[PDB]
Ligand binder design. Structure first.
Ligand SMILES: C=CC1=C(C)/C(=C/c2[nH]c(/C=C3N=C(/C=C4\NC(=O)C(C)=C4C=C)C(C)=C\3CCC(=O)O)c(CCC(=O)O)c2C)NC1=O
Length: 381
C-alpha cells in the first residue's frame, strides 16, 4: 500500500441516502396526482398546465367535512383514501400537518397558498363546519351576495390578491347570480434554488413551442452536479430548492411530450429514480412566470367526484339550505423561475437545456406530497 493518497482523490461525493419512507395519506395524494394530471394533459393538449395536486386534494377533503352520505364517501374514495384503513380524522390531520410544515418559516420556502369558500350571505353556516374549516384547513367561509355579481367578482379577486400579496391578482371573471358556494383555491410558488443562478450568465435563447413556432426567452445557465438521466429521446433532472423541496423536470423531443405524459405513474417514476445518478452537467432553464387556471367542476367530475357539484349534493354539514351545491370551483396556480429565489472540466459536460416543452414536479421532501406539477408549453404564457 504505497499509494500516493490514503483516499481516492478522484472519487466523487457520496450521495447515498436512506430509503424514502411514505405515509399512506401521501401515497394516496401521489397516486391521485398522477391520475388527475394524465387526464388534464389529455383535455388541455397544447397549453401551459400549473396545478397543485395536494392543494386540490386538501380543498376537497375540506368539502367532505361538510358533506354527508354518498356525497361524503365519494369524495373520500375518489381522492384515493380507504376509510377501512385510515380513520377519517387522520385524513384531516394529515392535510393539517401539510399546512403546518409548509408554513413553518424556519423552513426556507416561498410557497404561498390559500383556500376559501364563498357562500350566500342570507344563509347561516353551521358552526361545526366553521370550526373544522379553520382548525384543520386554515380556511375561511366568507358570506357573499351573488345576486350583485360585480361586487363578488371584485371581492373574491381582492381576497385572492390580499392573501397572495398581489402575486395572484385575478382568479374570477364572472359568477352566476344563482351561485350558492364558490370554492376558490390558489397557489404561488417561486423556485428558491439551493444553488442559485448567476444573472451574468443569463442569455436570450430560443424556446421551441412546436415544430414551427419559436419564441425568445431569457435562459439561466449553471454548471453543477445534479441528479439526472438521459437517453436519445428524453432528459430529466432533479433540482433541489432550499427547505427540503426538490423540483423534477423531464423533456422529450418535439411532439413526444404527450407520449410521456400519458405513461406517467408512480411505479415507472420509481424505476427512473434508480436510473438517475448525480452527474456534472450544464443546466439551462428558461426564466419564467407561468399561470394555470382550472375549472375543478369539469376536471373532478371526470375523476368521479360528481355528487358535490350536482343537484342532489348533500352538503347539510355546511348549511341547511335545501339544494345547496358547489356552483363554482376554481384552482389557479402560478410558478416563477428567476436567478436567486472554477477551472474548466476535462470533458465538456452534457448540456441539459430545457428549450422544448417540458413537465415539472415540485415535491415536499418532508411529507412526499406533490406541491405542484404541470407542463411548460410556452414560457410566454
Ligand atoms: C414514464 C415515465 C416517467 C418518468 C420519466 C418519470 C420520472 C420521475 N418521476 C418522479 C417522481 C414523481 N413524479 C411525480 C409526478 C409527476 N411527474 C411529472 O413530471 C409530472 C408532470 C407529474 C404529474 C403528476 C410524482 C408525484 C413523483 C413522486 C413519487 C414518489 O415520491 O413516490 C421521479 C423521481 C425524481 C427524484 O427522485 O428526484 C422521476 C425520475 N415518471 C414516469 O412515470
Amino acid at each position: 500500500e504505497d499509494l500516493k493518497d490514503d483516499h481516492d482523490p478522484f472519487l466523487p461525493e457520496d450521495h447515498k441516502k436512506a430509503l424514502f419512507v411514505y405515509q399512506k395519506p401521501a401515497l394516496n395524494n401521489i397516486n391521485f396526482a398522477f391520475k388527475m394530471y394524465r387526464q388534464l394533459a389529455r383535455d388541455h393538449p397544447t397549453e401551459n398546465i400549473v396545478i397543485s395536486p395536494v392543494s386540490i386534494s386538501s380543498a376537497l377533503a375540506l368539502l367532505s367535512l361538510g358533506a354527508k352520505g354518498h356525497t361524503h364517501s365519494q369524495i373520500v374514495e375518489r381522492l384515493g383514501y380507504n376509510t377501512s384503513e385510515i380513520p377519517e380524522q387522520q385524513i384531516h390531520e394529515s392535510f393539517h400537518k401539510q399546512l403546518d410544515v409548509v408554513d413553518d418559516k424556519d423552513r426556507d420556502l416561498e410557497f404561498e397558498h390559500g383556500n376559501a369558500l364563498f357562500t350566500c350571505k342570507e344563509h347561516k353556516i353551521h358552526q361545526t363546519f366553521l370550526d373544522d374549516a379553520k382548525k384543520f384547513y386554515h380556511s375561511e367561509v366568507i358570506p357573499t351576495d351573488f345576486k350583485n355579481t360585480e361586487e363578488a367578482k371584485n371581492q373574491i379577486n381582492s381576497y385572492v390578491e390580499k392573501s397572495t400579496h398581489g402575486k395572484i391578482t385575478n382568479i374570477l371573471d364572472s359568477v352566476d347570480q344563482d351561485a350558492m358556494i364558490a370554492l376558490i383555491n390558489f397557489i404561488y410558488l417561486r423556485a428558491n434554488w439551493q444553488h442559485p443562478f448567476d444573472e451574468k450568465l443569463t442569455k436570450e435563447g430560443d424556446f421551441h413551442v412546436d415544430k414551427d413556432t419559436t419564441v425568445k426567452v431569457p435562459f439561466m445557465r449553471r454548471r453543477g452536479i445534479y441528479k439526472m438521466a438521459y437517453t436519445d429521446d428524453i432528459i430529466m433532472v432533479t433540482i433541489p430548492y432550499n427547505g427540503s423541496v426538490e423540483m423534477f423536470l423531464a423533456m422529450t423531443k418535439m411532439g413526444k411530450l404527450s407520449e410521456l405524459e400519458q405513461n406517467l405513474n408512480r411505479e415507472r417514476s420509481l424505476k427512473w429514480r434508480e436510473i438517475m445518478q448525480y452527474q456534472l452537467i450544464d443546466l439551462s432553464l428558461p426564466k419564467l412566470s407561468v399561470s394555470g387556471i382550472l375549472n375543478l367542476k369539469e376536471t373532478l367530475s371526470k375523476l368521479g367526484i360528481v355528487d358535490v357539484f350536482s343537484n342532489h349534493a348533500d352538503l347539510s354539514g355546511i348549511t341547511d339550505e335545501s339544494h345547496l351545491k358547489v356552483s363554482k370551483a376554481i384552482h389557479k396556480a402560478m410558478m416563477s423561475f428567476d436567478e436567486h429565489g472554477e477551472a474548466d472540466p476535462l470533458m465538456l459536460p452534457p448540456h441539459f437545456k430545457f428549450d422544448y416543452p417540458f413537465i415539472f414536479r415540485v415535491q415536499d421532501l418532508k411529507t412526499k406530497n406533490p406541491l405542484l406539477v404541470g407542463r411548460i408549453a410556452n414560457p410566454q404564457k
